[PDB]
Structure 1
Amino acid sequence: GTILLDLAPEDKEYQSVEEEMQSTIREHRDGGNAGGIFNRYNVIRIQKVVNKKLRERFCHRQKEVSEENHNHHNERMLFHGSPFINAIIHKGFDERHAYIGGMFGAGIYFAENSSKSNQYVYGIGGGTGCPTHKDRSCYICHRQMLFCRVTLGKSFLQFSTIKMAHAPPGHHSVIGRPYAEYVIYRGEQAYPEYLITYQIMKPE
């Protein structure tokens, strides 16, 4: 049982999440082919995801990661876009659904930028876009993304395109740069904290 609690737009928590979502928009070298063309989002609602079993898996793993990393779990708030967003908020993140085609190997990817996670809301390369109008830049259909708690532990900073199946010895994640891509190889190293419902906006 998952419970979705609506945050009020007047709430400082809602405002912090939207600020983070809006302010991390950047330009992509694909000219918005995957996510669409926009400079801003229209945030419809923001919901806190509550699930006892998911919180327990996450908290149990944070404890293990801190023991291995001098009592530091090194948690970050990172974005995630997926066409499996409903399965995440009910069953959690699953490394058995790792992104094989990723630059840093078969892991679960998170972005520091909401605009990067938006390219994956309809699948790899933006897929076929919105189910209704098969448009990767649909401004009508409501999209969804997550703003997650990510247990990075001891991160391994990678610069090359070395594909890894697991984190290097002694490490709990991979940070990749040429923006930054965060990779985790265990589903229980991320909690889907907030479910953001939004639209991409057509510039005037």
Structure 2
Amino acid sequence: GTILLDLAPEDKEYQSVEEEMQSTIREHRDGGNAGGIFNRYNVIRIQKVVNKKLRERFCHRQKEVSEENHNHHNERMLFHGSPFINAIIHKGFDERHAYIGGMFGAGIYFAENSSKSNQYVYGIGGGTGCPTHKDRSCYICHRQMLFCRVTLGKSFLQFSTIKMAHAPPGHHSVIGRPAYAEYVIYRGEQAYPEYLITYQIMKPE
């Protein structure tokens, strides 16, 4: 069982999570075709995810990664947008659902920028938009994304669009660069869905 703990907007933990969410919005070449047209979000609530078994898989895998990377797990807080968010908070990240069409191959993707993860809340290319109004730029429906603990360990920095089924020897993750940085992991137990964020994209005035 998963427990969702509501963080209060007065909490420094909440202020930190939203600040990171708001401050990392940037412009995309698709002119917001996938995620929608916005300059800001409207944060409805932020919740801490608590699952005893998913923390066991994650903490077990950190120990393994640090032994292979000189007592350093190189953990980063990264965004994740998925049409599978409900299955992640209950059963965890699963590499059997890796993004086949990814630039850096069949792995699990994470963004530094909330704007990039927002383009995947409804699927690849914004899917067919929100389930109610079939709108990729819907300002009514409450969207969701995760702010995750990601054990990167030894990252392999990639620049070319080279499809990899697994990380290169000695490495635990792949960082791809050219408009923004993409973080790829090949093991589901290398991310923990720390925060579940419920928000809306805002129609500019």
Bucket of the pairwise TM-score, normalised by the shorter protein = over 0.9
Residue 145 of structure 1: CA displacement? 0.1
Inter-partner Cα distance in structure 1 for 2:86 and 2:197: 12
Residue 166 of structure 1: CA displacement? 0.1
Deviations 1:50-78 (Å, cap 9, x if unpaired)?
A: 00000000000000000000000000000
Inter-partner Cα distance in structure 2 for 1:176 and 1:143: 26
TM-score with structure 1 setting the length: 1.00
Residue 170 of structure 1: CA displacement? 0.2
Inter-partner Cα distance in structure 1 for 2:120 and 2:164: 21
Aligned partner of residue 144 in structure 1, secondary structure: strand
Residue 175 of structure 1: CA displacement? 0.1
Post-superposition, which runs of at least 4 consecutive aligned residues in structure 1 deviate over 6 A? Answer: none
TM-score with structure 2 setting the length: 0.99
| RMSD over aligned Cα atoms | 0.2
The equivalent of 1:126 in structure 2 is 126
Inter-partner Cα distance in structure 2 for 1:162 and 1:199: 34
Deviations 1:10-43 (Å, cap 9, x if unpaired)?
A: 0000000000000000000000000000000000
Residue 130 of structure 1: CA displacement? 0.3
Inter-partner Cα distance in structure 2 for 1:151 and 1:161: 23
The equivalent of 2:184 in structure 1 is 183
How many residues are aligned here?
204
Deviations 1:136-185 (Å, cap 9, x if unpaired)?
A: 00000000000000000000000000000000000000000000000000
Inter-partner Cα distance in structure 1 for 2:44 and 2:24: 18
Inter-partner Cα distance in structure 2 for 1:195 and 1:103: 26
Q: Which runs of 5+ in 2 are unaligned?
A: none
